[PDB]
Nucleic acid binder design. Sequence first.
DNA 1: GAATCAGGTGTC
Length: 222
Amino acid sequence: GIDELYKKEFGIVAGVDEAGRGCLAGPVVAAAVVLEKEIEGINDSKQLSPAKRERLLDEIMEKAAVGIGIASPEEIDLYNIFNATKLAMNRALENLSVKPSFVLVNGKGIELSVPGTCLVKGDQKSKLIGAASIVAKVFRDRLMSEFHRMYPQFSFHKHKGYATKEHLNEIRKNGVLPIHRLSFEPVLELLTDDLLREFFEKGLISENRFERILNLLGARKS
DNA sequence: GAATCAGGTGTC
Ligand SMILES: [Mn+2]
Ligand SMILES: [Mn+2]
Ligand SMILES: [Mn+2]
């Protein structure tokens, strides 16, 4: 119903949500979702079972229009997690085929390239956002799994890059990766100016990424 | 799914 109020008022209304905010690795995934056909079971992903999201997505990506945006781990470091988040969100709206006259954005304090509004707990106040919530999360998880493929020594399919005990084990044992968020404190902690220069000399990170994390590295213990 | 332990950073 919340959706319908805004639908009647503003016209085409997209729901937006993102996943991967609190992660130590990988990009942040945002999803924009416009939908008219009803989908029973709609609810914020984190209440659902991983396998149910799966069946709800197949359904969602059949009755709805969906845009997907991502922001690079490099962009998180250079821009911060928040602007990287808005950036990802705006890339989703961009990828959406339907151009909404209005957006419902989960959270607070986010203003996108499309006039809209910000709902706290929006992912459980709105069906569109709850749906955008399931798209982001599943798509993200998928990105992380194939990262276990690219870095076999890493349980990215289990911990999704988050600060779990075993993720921190895999980092101390195996080292820090370019896809880790180098500005994120637990990583900054383990990283050395020596590995940082290597990343750069290998052409793995950017000159701008290097300068930041380097300046961040020397700023430690302050 | 809910409880409760862990672990991240942006806004203001
Ligand atoms: Mn929520
Ligand atoms: Mn959510
Ligand atoms: Mn900070």
